[PDB]
Symmetry: D3
């Protein structure tokens, strides 16, 4: 759906700048507090495939299954798992089907299962840890697959851009995208000048 | 909607029993971890009017406004506020319109504003604290008004019964209600026997 | 340097739940001391800050220095970091504080000798209570009339404190009147809005 | 299998607060003497007596709690190590009746409690970290062994030593140092009770 | 009392992410030690527990007693409560542990002398690292071959530990074989399910 | 406005770990000597030097951070008290360039950091609690005063005293006790380096 010529231009921006400019627009809550980079040296931007977990009513995972077959290639996955230290949102298998489907990145307010195998895969993912547990093993089990999400302290709606970095993830809404792509270029260059004068 | 002859009979049950029996049915997650009683000595059961807060995207409260005018008298309000220590979900005003509308109780995974005035009102409410802040003042602002809710570690769907007590709140789903009303009577009496033999 | 005594008598007629909304109106966004909870309900305090600050220990007293300088109407804004191993005040110091007529105490910490300092009819605001005393486990006392980061807010010595069951709020002497002339506006159109919902 | 202490030292100790006792123990080379966590269930009390210690431990799905109450002699205090779990209400209404019929002095729980509305109307004083509808083995803990060295709070508590507990908190005073407090605190009371006037 | 050496050589071929699912299958629900994180990546450990337990201090050594009883293949399941003020092991004890051939260490606590105990090619699992040493701030050592509540799980002396980057899992000698005869079932129909998704 | 110390004591101290220094300070009557919180940004380092201390404080919406870097002499270490805030990235890419051009030895932050991908490729070693896209005054903190007594970690740090910092953590060694470590640790090294063989 989004303009592919913007996912490119937004990628030239760092989260630390895209967040600092989202501020002056009048939006302080754009940094996902929780998700950290599994491995160093990555940057990712793209539309946000939202995933929402909910607390498990034991017998009251084709909730999150129906997401992976809905990845228009180049998407970023944003998962709401409440920072649970006992649910693995994605395992070694479901990450394969992500990069094979054209996945750009993964951001989780939770943890991720099978760390040794999933590190040696070509997808950068942001999580709060690593568990042996799977999704529907503990107090949580998946729910929806394209709805508003409270990962971090941020409102991540389906479609918005996620400028992932080593500083963390920053949600840029599809409305204020170009407003920043142009506002950050005139910033990181002004900054780039002062870098060479020293 | 629910059978009024069950809200009565469920009220004869304590949360500590209704939760312990919800367990053996095959449901461990029924106790809302967080909400505590504002004042001692209360018990409440009724259908759950669900309220869901979401993180505030500053300029992107008629979300929670549309709940209070939807209280078929006798309801219980269950609020998802993520235990925020900087959002007052309900103030001295909106609690009046609750008991005036026929509100049975309030359960909040957050805090409540204007504690001195709201204590001298005839409604029992469960919260995690008291704030001077209002709802849309901090990182949160309301969202939906009759949807699934993750207050506590529990899945609270619209309609289910909330057997509030001093032990805390326990969500009894409309399916397993009668299964427990009859299972707890044969328990707390068996227990009541052993109370008199000592 | 206590200010207009009519500010207290007028601001004490403002809830803290309103003082935030009318300080948030003024742009002052963080004014609620996240931590201090009322020891017993029904209290209400308004007055200037006599900020007490603690800092971690090292073994290389300043706690009395505040009390010998307490003035009637003062509020004791203590920055104890929430240490559940340091009793900031006890049976003695609470007396010395009320022997002078201290209007109230707001602590980001705990209390020594809870069973006694409750019958002493002085309103307190702390994070708990401990059988420890200050400078026992992890932090000495320190400066006694300086800026203080009490909950997540800057308490500058002189500011006004509004402490009701919601918690305490810091009202600076600079922007103090703009709230009383906006709480009156609020209360009027709350009172009238309260009359109508009844009938 | 310890043995009860000099009963006239317990009565001589209940004149002492937990602050002073914790302060003297600090001066004797024992800074770990305040059980951080347990708060009073109701406002006015004082309890002194030895510690019949109960230790919970994590429940691996492969009745030693009832045996604890069988060994509760009069005048003694119960100490529980429940790791502060908000999903294991240790002692319910019934197991506290047994504690009072045996003449128990008080209860200190590094964990929540079961059947709050009832146990608040019993005469026993309890210090704990909350209240739950869960029971003692429902979730992630279960009773393990009794009368072993217990680490409740942050304090090393071995079965036998005395537990002064006012509204400040609980303090484990060992028997070998129990007299050294009564000598120091007795005259220290004449110190403090004097200067209260000038 | 180390068991069937073929259990190690067969269980070490099972990930911890699978051992949970096949212990959760057996009803054993809490088997993941919530806390211990790998010091450096790429490690893998399987062996019996030599459970070390700490308890809070009082000032009234048992830490070496474990090491003088460490046996080749042992895993050191330490219960340090996550104390960021107690260095459980240092440059010395890590050697003594590997001088005996200790297969790995799983700590619910921290580490003393991180810059050195990383070049020592022994896989560790802790909650952090501290310039403190054990029995300095808040807890003594204690029993050295008893049951241990390491993360939120009961480590009984004898059980098997599977520690890969996900964290450690406690496999009891009782129900150890039922997993290897179910991980083989899993891996086969994961491998075949992995072949197909490619093409 | 302190003054630099005996530079040949700093070089004599960089031979000492932070464990031993913290251990000696413990033996000298100073148990508060490890800044709990700050972790290394990258794995292999050691930094010793005095503390140019910066103190953040809560931001009340009514540039003393740039003035801190102006006073940074060579060989010294920077200490920041940011209360561990995950919404105030204190020093960015630029303000670390200034720190290295001035010849700063190292940075220790009781808080997160700004512009992670860049500052990891600079030669400076930093100890902090995370990484953020937020900047130094965006959210709830803002720079207050510099070169005042700083409480970063759990330690009393007054401007001037030395900060040994390996991969274990940071340790504030006061100047008056700085020599007492080098004497004790020097021979203690001959103690430990000996028994490493038997």
């Amino acid at each position: 759906r989004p303009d592919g010529e913007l996912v490119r231009s937004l990628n030239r921006v760092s989260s630390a700048t895209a967040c600092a400019k989202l501020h002056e627009l009048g939006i302080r809550r754009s940094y996902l507090s929780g998700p950290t980079a599994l491995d160093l040296g990555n940057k990712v931007t793209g539309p946000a495939r939202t995933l929402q977990f909910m607390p498990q009513r034991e017998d009251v995972s084709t909730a999150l299954w129906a997401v992976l077959e809905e990845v228009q290639p180049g998407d970023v996955l944003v998962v709401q798992a409440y920072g649970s230290a006992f649910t693995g949102c994605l395992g070694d298998m479901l990450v394969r089907y992500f990069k094979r489907k054209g996945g750009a990145g993964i951001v989780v307010d939770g943890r991720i299962r099978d760390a040794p195998r999933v590190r040696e895969l070509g997808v950068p993912i942001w999580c709060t840890g690593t568990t042996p547990h799977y999704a529907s093993q503990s107090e949580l089990f998946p729910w929806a697959y394209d709805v508003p999400v409270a990962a971090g302290g941020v409102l991540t709606l389906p479609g918005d851009l996620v400028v992932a970095d080593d500083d963390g993830a920053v949600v840029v809404p599809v409305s204020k995208a170009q407003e920043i792509v142009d506002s950050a270029f005139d910033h990181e260059q002004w900054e780039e000048f002062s870098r060479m004068r020293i």
